[PDB]
Ligand binder design. Structure first.
Ligand code: HEM
Length: 137
C-alpha cells in the first residue's frame, strides 16, 4: 500500500523522481514556463542539467517525507504551511501540484508494479486541499 510505495520509491529515488517529473513535464508542456532553462530540451538533455537533477531530487526527497508523515494519505497541516512559505514557489498555484500528482498516478498505473495508485490520487488531492487551507492561490 501507500507506506510500502514510499519505501519502493525511496529505494531508487533518483530514477523515479526524474521519470515522474519528466512524465509531468511531457503531459503538461505549458508547465515548462516555470522552468525557462527547460524549453527545447529532450528528456536525456534535461537529465544532464544540474538544476533539473537538483530540483527533482529535492521535490521527491521532501514529497516522500510529507507522505511518510501523513495519516491515511492526509498530510500534516505543518507540511502544507512549509510548502506554501517556500520563496522559490512564489509564482505557483494549487494547479501546478494537481498536475504533478495526475502525472505521478498515471505513471504508477502504467508501471509493471503493484503501486497503490488510488492512495496516491487521494494523497495528491488531500495535499492540494491542505495547500489551499495554508494560503496557496
Ligand atoms: C511536493 C512538490 C515540490 C517540492 C517538495 C518542491 C521543492 C522545492 C525545493 C526544496 C526547492 C528549492 C531547492 C532547489 O531549487 O533545488 C524548489 C525550487 C523550485 N521549485 Fe519546487 N517543489 C515542488 C513542486 C514544484 C512544482 C509542481 C513546480 C512547478 C510546476 C515547482 C517549481 C519550482 C521552481 C521554479 C523552483 C526554483 C527554480 C528551479 O526549479 O530551478 N516546484 N522546489
Amino acid at each position: 500500500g501507500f507506506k510500502q510505495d514510499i519505501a519502493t520509491l525511496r529505494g531508487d529515488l533518483r530514477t523515479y523522481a526524474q521519470d515522474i517529473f519528466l512524465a509531468f513535464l511531457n503531459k503538461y508542456p505549458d508547465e515548462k514556463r516555470n522552468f525557462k532553462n527547460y524549453v527545447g530540451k529532450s528528456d536525456q538533455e534535461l537529465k544532464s542539467m544540474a538544476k533539473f537533477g537538483d530540483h527533482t531530487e529535492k521535490v521527491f526527497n521532501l514529497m516522500m517525507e510529507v507522505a511518510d508523515r501523513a495519516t491515511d494519505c492526509v498530510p500534516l497541516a505543518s507540511d502544507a504551511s512549509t510548502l506554501v512559505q517556500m520563496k522559490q514557489h512564489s509564482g505557483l498555484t494549487t494547479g501546478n501540484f494537481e498536475k504533478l500528482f495526475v502525472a505521478l498516478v498515471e505513471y504508477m498505473r502504467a508501471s509493471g508494479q503493484s503501486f497503490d495508485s488510488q492512495s496516491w490520487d487521494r494523497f495528491g488531492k488531500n495535499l492540494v486541499s491542505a495547500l489551499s487551507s495554508a494560503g496557496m492561490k
